[PDB]
Structure 1
Amino acid sequence: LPNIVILATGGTIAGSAATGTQTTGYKAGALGVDTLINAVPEVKKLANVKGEQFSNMASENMTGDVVLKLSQRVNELLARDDVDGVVITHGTDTVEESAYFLHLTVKSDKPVVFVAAMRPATAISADGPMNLLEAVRVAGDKQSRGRGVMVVINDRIGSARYITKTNASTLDTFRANEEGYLGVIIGNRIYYQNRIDKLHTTRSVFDVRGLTSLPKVDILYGYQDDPEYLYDAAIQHGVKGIVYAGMGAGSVSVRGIAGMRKALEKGVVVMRSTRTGNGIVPPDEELPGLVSDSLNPAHARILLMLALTRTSDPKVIQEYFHTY
């Protein structure tokens, strides 16, 4: 059997409430990794599992500095011969951020599978148990190698680069509308459909094993009457980059343009993404800053932070966004 380590960080999958009917407002990251493993003994037939408690928090509190530590730990684990893959339990809210970060920084082809749950472990029809079993099956399957970081939940396997939480409260919230899933798990069998056509893991130039923190990047929303003062505030607090969750295709109002101009003059890298949820923000030389390709705001921030650890050259950063 494959040797899989289950690195727990918290989340609803490890969440609990007083009643089985409470599916909201519960406490995330309240249960220990062994408790999750013990709740689904069946996993032992899929692999030799070892639980490790990295953290136990609600993912809304996951921070870059900690995600960095998470990446370094997974790298140490995957470096071992006695480890065939890693399953990371994480909160659903920012799992797309943590997953994409590792997608870009893990220097190994061994499976790295993030797993989450939309209902707490104590809930009626809790999804966590099955999601966990599926994540371990994916992590231990030899066919799962070299596919980049994955997010497993609700019978689906999504690429960290495309998958995103699209719904605030549904079990089937994780989807990649335009890119689909890398594969699915039905009847205890994995069906691989796609291989992402982007750079990742072993072919990524991003290495952070020698860092303890990342460049500061904030996200500003785009909407009617969007204020210039928010750009002022960001610049003033030392951001190194600003990701714009823009209206439509990263379109900018006169006030947004004024703010971006100020940011650029201060050496801040401006990256134009979109608030819409899907699609391409195309290049436009008549607008300030760079464009995020198909990266949504949350994903764009992660890549920009990592990009900033290697260069401040706009052209190099722009190419990164079209290839990662």
Structure 2
Amino acid sequence: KLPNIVILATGGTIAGVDTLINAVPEVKKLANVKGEQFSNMASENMTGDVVLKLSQRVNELLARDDVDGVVITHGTDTVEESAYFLHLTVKSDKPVVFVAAMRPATAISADGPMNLLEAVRVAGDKQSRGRGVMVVLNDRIGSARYITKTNASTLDTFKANEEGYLGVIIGNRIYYQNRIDKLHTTRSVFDVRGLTSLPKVDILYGYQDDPEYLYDAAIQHGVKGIVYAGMGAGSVSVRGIAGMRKAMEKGVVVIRSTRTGNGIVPPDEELPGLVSDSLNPAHARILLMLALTRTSDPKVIQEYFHTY
């Protein structure tokens, strides 16, 4: 028979979850779908405490024998943060597929309907198991660890320039290309099912004349971590170095990432802080927050940035 798929709605312009389902009745030929309204917000207002609750609910659903996979509708702007959080914390090999739309549901040539169909097909395919959390738009299956919104406004915005897609959906058929060589889901050390709150982590940009006082402000409000969206390969001005050294003196963990959009920030002993490997600032903040729920050991956190 058909796979059993829960469509868990959080908001986003792709949207009422039942209104969405009935607007795309073809999904009912791909799966037995049940809609659940988890929240209804624009994703720029999604917060870590709500994402935590999202992961806890998804873990509960996937523990059920009558649930084969979950599709999560979400706004595009921060889907990559929510998706990567669940990538590290969902303790199941059953597919979890985030889906979103770049055009509103009323727009001409709205992309939401076909994105949803594709997400349900992916979530219901036996071959989709064990691949980590996925993000599906525009016929592409992206890994939550590599995929990012690369363009403010286009349909094809979700890309992983250096890492490619896990697969594509063409002609109602899934073509799997890659498995990511990173830890996730069932292999992940992270289990947050007993957590109720998350560590505070802020992101500071790197640019000519970047100011020291933004580090001061972050320290004074009690951040546990700072992610630096650095110039080039996490390069730091003399002002940023002063700010990072002050932050580390107060026990704040600093991760140097990159503002460029892609690539590796390599280790460098003459610079302060840890390095983000190929994690962009938004993903690096998610991983650092979760790491800080378990450890403050810099060697462990640095390995996590190389392996997750």
> What TM-score results when the alignment is normalised by the length of structure 2?
0.99
RMSD: 0.3
Structure 1 residue 266 displacement after superposition: 0.2
The reply to whether residue 8 of structure 1 matches residue 19 of structure 2 is no
Structure 1 residue 225 displacement after superposition: 0.1
String of CA shifts for 1:244-300, please: whole Å, max 9, x gaps. 000000000000000000000000000000000000000000000000000000000
Structure 1 residue 226 displacement after superposition: 0.1
Supply the distance in 2 between the matched residues of 1:160 and 1:232 (Cα, whole angstroms).
32
Structure 1 residue 66 displacement after superposition: 0.2
Structure 1 residue 213 displacement after superposition: 1.2
Q: Which residue of 1 aligns with 2:206?
A: 222
String of CA shifts for 1:3-46, please: whole Å, max 9, x gaps. 00000000121xxxxxxxxxxxxxxxxxx000110011010110
Structure 1 residue 196 displacement after superposition: 0.3
Secondary structure of the corresponding residue to residue 199 of structure 1 = coil
Secondary structure of the corresponding residue to residue 151 of structure 1 = strand
Supply the distance in 2 between the matched residues of 1:150 and 1:11 (Cα, whole angstroms).
17
Supply the distance in 2 between the matched residues of 1:212 and 1:86 (Cα, whole angstroms).
23
Supply the distance in 1 between the matched residues of 2:256 and 2:60 (Cα, whole angstroms).
35
Q: Where does structure 1 lack aligned partners over 5 or more consecutive residues?
A: 14-31
String of CA shifts for 1:38-67, please: whole Å, max 9, x gaps. 011010110000000000000000000000
Supply the distance in 2 between the matched residues of 1:100 and 1:289 (Cα, whole angstroms).
22
The reply to whether residue 259 of structure 1 matches residue 260 of structure 2 is no
Secondary structure of the corresponding residue to residue 121 of structure 1 = coil
String of CA shifts for 1:202-254, please: whole Å, max 9, x gaps. 00000100001110000000000000000000000010000000000000000
Q: Which residue of 1 aligns with 2:294?
A: 310
Structure 1 residue 137 displacement after superposition: 0.1
> What TM-score results when the alignment is normalised by the length of structure 1?
0.94
Secondary structure of the corresponding residue to residue 10 of structure 2 = strand
The reply to whether residue 84 of structure 1 matches residue 68 of structure 2 is yes
String of CA shifts for 1:132-163, please: whole Å, max 9, x gaps. 00000000000000000000000000000000
Query: Which 4+ runs in 1 deviate beyond 2 A?
Result: none
Secondary structure of the corresponding residue to residue 242 of structure 2 = helix
String of CA shifts for 1:76-104, please: whole Å, max 9, x gaps. 00000000000000000000000000000
Secondary structure of the corresponding residue to residue 244 of structure 1 = strand
Secondary structure of the corresponding residue to residue 113 of structure 1 = strand
String of CA shifts for 1:101-147, please: whole Å, max 9, x gaps. 00000000000000000000000000000000000000000000000
String of CA shifts for 1:166-219, please: whole Å, max 9, x gaps. 000000000000000000000000000000000000000001000011100000
Supply the distance in 2 between the matched residues of 1:203 and 1:192 (Cα, whole angstroms).
21
Supply the distance in 1 between the matched residues of 2:13 and 2:227 (Cα, whole angstroms).
28
Supply the distance in 2 between the matched residues of 1:256 and 1:293 (Cα, whole angstroms).
19
Supply the distance in 1 between the matched residues of 2:268 and 2:187 (Cα, whole angstroms).
29
Supply the distance in 2 between the matched residues of 1:249 and 1:35 (Cα, whole angstroms).
46
Supply the distance in 2 between the matched residues of 1:313 and 1:289 (Cα, whole angstroms).
12
Supply the distance in 2 between the matched residues of 1:284 and 1:12 (Cα, whole angstroms).
42
Supply the distance in 1 between the matched residues of 2:129 and 2:58 (Cα, whole angstroms).
15
Q: Where does structure 2 lack aligned partners over 5 or more consecutive residues?
A: none
Structure 1 residue 317 displacement after superposition: 0.2
